[PDB]
Every structure is written in structure tokens, then in C-alpha cells.
Design a protein around this ligand. Structure first.
Ligand SMILES: [Ca+2]
Ligand SMILES: [Ca+2]
Length: 108
């Protein structure tokens, strides 16, 4: 779903690095996959994908499936990984990650 925004090479290496359960770190994934250097238009396309439906937010259960947006058969994040990722992104603490949070998080 990221064809045209992120290259396959980086996506391959990013998934590879966080292979073992609990090895995931969103900041490392962002950097390796090439997200932090993308335009505002691509960063919003990325949000629309990860957020799945049209609730306008990345709900926790959606976050858990973060890696699958890149590779269909990727593993789901662990409860631990999901919580760490959510905690760092959910600035307003409403339990989910909205667009502003996403934009900001990608800039941190
Ligand atoms: Ca959603
Ligand atoms: Ca939030």
C-alpha cells in the first residue's frame, strides 16, 4: 500500500530488523523505512493507510497491525510493543493517535 512513497528495499530491511517479537521500535522503523524524510503529502497518505477505516484516528487495535500495512503477512506487534508505540504518540492521552499527533510523532 506504500508503492510510490516508500521503496521496497527499505521496507524489507525495516521489517527484518524488528523480526523477533518485542524487537520493534517505531523510531528506528520510521528512519529505516524512510518516513521521516517524506513530504507532508506522503506523511498524510501514510496516516490514512495505518489508520485503516475512516474514524479519523489510529485506534490501538489498528496500531497493533502497523507492520501489516507494509507487508500483508508481517507479524502483529506485541501488546507491549503496541502500548509503547501508542504511549509515545498519543500526546492527548485519549487512547488513540490522531493526525496532528501522527505528523508530530514523525517529526520527533
Ligand atoms: Ca481508524
Ligand atoms: Ca490522541
Amino acid at each position: 500500500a506504500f508503492a510510490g512513497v516508500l521503496n521496497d528495499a527499505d521496507i524489507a530491511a525495516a521489517l527484518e530488523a524488528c523480526k523477533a517479537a518485542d524487537s520493534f521500535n517505531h523510531k528506528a522503523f520510521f528512519a529505516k523505512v524512510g518516513l521521516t524524510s517524506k513530504s507532508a503529502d506522503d506523511v498524510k497518505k501514510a496516516f490514512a493507510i495505518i489508520a485503516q477505516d475512516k474514524s479519523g484516528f489510529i485506534e490501538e487495535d489498528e496500531l497493533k497491525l502497523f507492520l501489516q500495512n507494509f507487508k500483508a503477512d508481517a507479524r502483529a506487534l506485541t501488546d507491549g510493543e503496541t502500548k509503547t508505540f501508542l504511549k509515545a504518540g498519543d500526546s492527548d492521552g485519549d487512547g488513540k493517535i490522531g493526525v496532528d499527533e501522527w505528523t508530530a510523532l514523525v517529526k520527533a
